[PDB]
Amino acid sequence: QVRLSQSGGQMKKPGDSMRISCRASGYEFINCPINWIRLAPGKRPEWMGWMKPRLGAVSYARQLQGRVTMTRDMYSETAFLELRSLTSDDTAVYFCTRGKYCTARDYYNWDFEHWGQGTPVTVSSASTKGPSVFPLAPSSKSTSGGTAALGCLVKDYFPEPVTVSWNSGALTSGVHTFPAVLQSSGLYSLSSVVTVPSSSLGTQTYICNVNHKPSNTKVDKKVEPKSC
């Protein structure tokens, strides 16, 4: 039975290099090429290249030329991947794979029946940045039979995660804390909102409590209607 076993996950910094292994068993190693595919949440699966064990012939994806190296050890039947000049864009789960059809006389590379279990690699800066907390003000006029939405915008922080509570956790009903988005600047941002009766806008105080453990940051922000 064909098996591919990969080395453990790791965390790297921008500028570093990474190396990962894929041990193969259950078939004649030299008969079939081995491929490396990486998976990142949000993006297309990316074929990085293949490596034919017999004489180590390789073919690297264009956009990775010069950064990637694929070798192998015949005796231990292990394939190896190296990627240099790591950036945030290299954060992904790395797989080694081999095609379904593989005989001593012929193969087809691209129907990937066989997959390693995957090797998660995180590339990120050791720097941390505290969030900005801006009030998302309800409105101007108070209504005595309608519901009001309010919240706070938690902007430009790194890395994940931030958590948000309201009124030190006393307010939970109608609260929505949205998954963070990654901005173009490389910094994260999210929103937390809550719907409340509009008649309680001049009576109850609404504080959002933002927590960002990596930057050791705890911020309370009162969200009140703009005086005009």
Binding site: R54, A57, A61, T71
Partner: protein
């Protein structure tokens, strides 16, 4: 009425039983005398399909060449499977002779005669023969040496050009000589000479052919991406010695795009410790013989791989390939297929 079939072919040659040369000795015991009066029958109103990449003739030739090399080029030490085999390693006389492959009774070889035939697909001009032409079992990588030339234009051959895992065979219609020499009086150091004028003109024709297959994209050559020396360099056996030549200069994009003219000299080296192309492992041979070791060969083809990847740029990149010696045999057996009569 016939049909495509597979059988055990017999070999024929013009070997000499008085010759101490390795290919001759093998062929004497493995093959029969050749036919002075061959017979070829051109078939009218007949259209047959061919596929050089699924031609089982290639498999048999492979076994033969492996047997030939194993019975002859015996190492001093054989390093495979974590074990060590110490044998005797005397120097030998080595010079590949032509080998004809032939069909037994009930079978016959169909031959494609279309001048622009690319290796796969239908063939209009088909003839019937009992034996192939004389094929030299030349083992090499990157460059195809001493082979037969294409009749008309340069022919691009691939099982599937859109599949970057499939080898491309470029079949030349005008040979270019490569003159490799290990001088007398580092004994392992050698060099190859090529006429830059001839080569760069052929290479330019190669890119224009490639343009026809790749939508007039800019065609770019690059050194191999990696691998063992046997494939990152032009690997071949001359007079018994294993040569490794650095072909970086052979694929100079500047010259196919002043001064490039002249005699190109590729740096070579003779290794005594090699990786076997038979997929076996590391073999160890004695030091080279004294005196001028030289061989002049026809470059008759090129082995290439094409870069892939989620790109969008206006250019295709090609790199010298090889390693699968079965491809060497395909490049000569491409116009042949075995059929069974009833």
């Amino acid at each position: 009425v016939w049909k495509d079939a597979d059988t055990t072919l017999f070999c024929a040659s013009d070997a000499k039983a008085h010759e101490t040369e390795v290919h001759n000795v093998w062929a004497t015991h493995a093959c029969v005398p050749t036919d002075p009066n061959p017979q070829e029958i051109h078939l009218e109103n007949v259209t047959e399909n061919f596929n050089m990449w699924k031609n089982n003739m290639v498999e048999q030739m492979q076994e033969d060449v492996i047997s030939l090399w194993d019975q002859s080029l015996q190492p001093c030490v054989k390093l495979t499977g974590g074990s060590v085999i110490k044998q005797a390693c005397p120097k030998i006389s080595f010079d590949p002779i032509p080998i004809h492959y032939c069909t037994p009774a009930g079978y016959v070889i169909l031959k494609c005669n279309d001048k622009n035939f690319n290796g796969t697909g239908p063939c209009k001009n088909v003839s019937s023969v009992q034996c192939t032409h004389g094929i030299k079992p030349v083992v090499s990588t990157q460059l195809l040496l001493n082979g037969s030339l294409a009749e008309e234009e340069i022919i691009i051959r691939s099982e599937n050009l859109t599949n970057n895992a499939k080898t491309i065979i470029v079949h030349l219609n005008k040979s270019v000589e490569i003159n490799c020499t290990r001088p007398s009086n580092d004994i392992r150091k050698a060099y190859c000479e090529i006429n830059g004028t001839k080569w760069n003109k052929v290479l330019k024709q190669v890119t224009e052919k490639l343009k026809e297959h790749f939508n007039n994209k800019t065609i770019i050559f690059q050194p191999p991406s990696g691998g063992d020396l046997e494939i990152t360099m032009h690997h071949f056996n001359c007079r018994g010695e294993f040569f490794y030549c650095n072909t970086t200069q052979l694929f100079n994009n500047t010259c196919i795009g002043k001064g490039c003219n002249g005699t190109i000299t590729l740096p070579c080296k003779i290794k005594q410790i090699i990786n076997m192309w038979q997929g076996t492992g590391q073999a160890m041979y004695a030091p080279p013989i004294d005196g001028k070791i030289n061989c002049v060969s026809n470059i008759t083809g090129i082995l290439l791989t094409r870069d892939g990847g989620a790109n969008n740029t206006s250019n295709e990149t090609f790199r010298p390939g090889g390693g699968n010696i079965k491809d060497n045999w395909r490049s000569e057996l491409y116009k042949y297929k075995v059929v069974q009569i009833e």
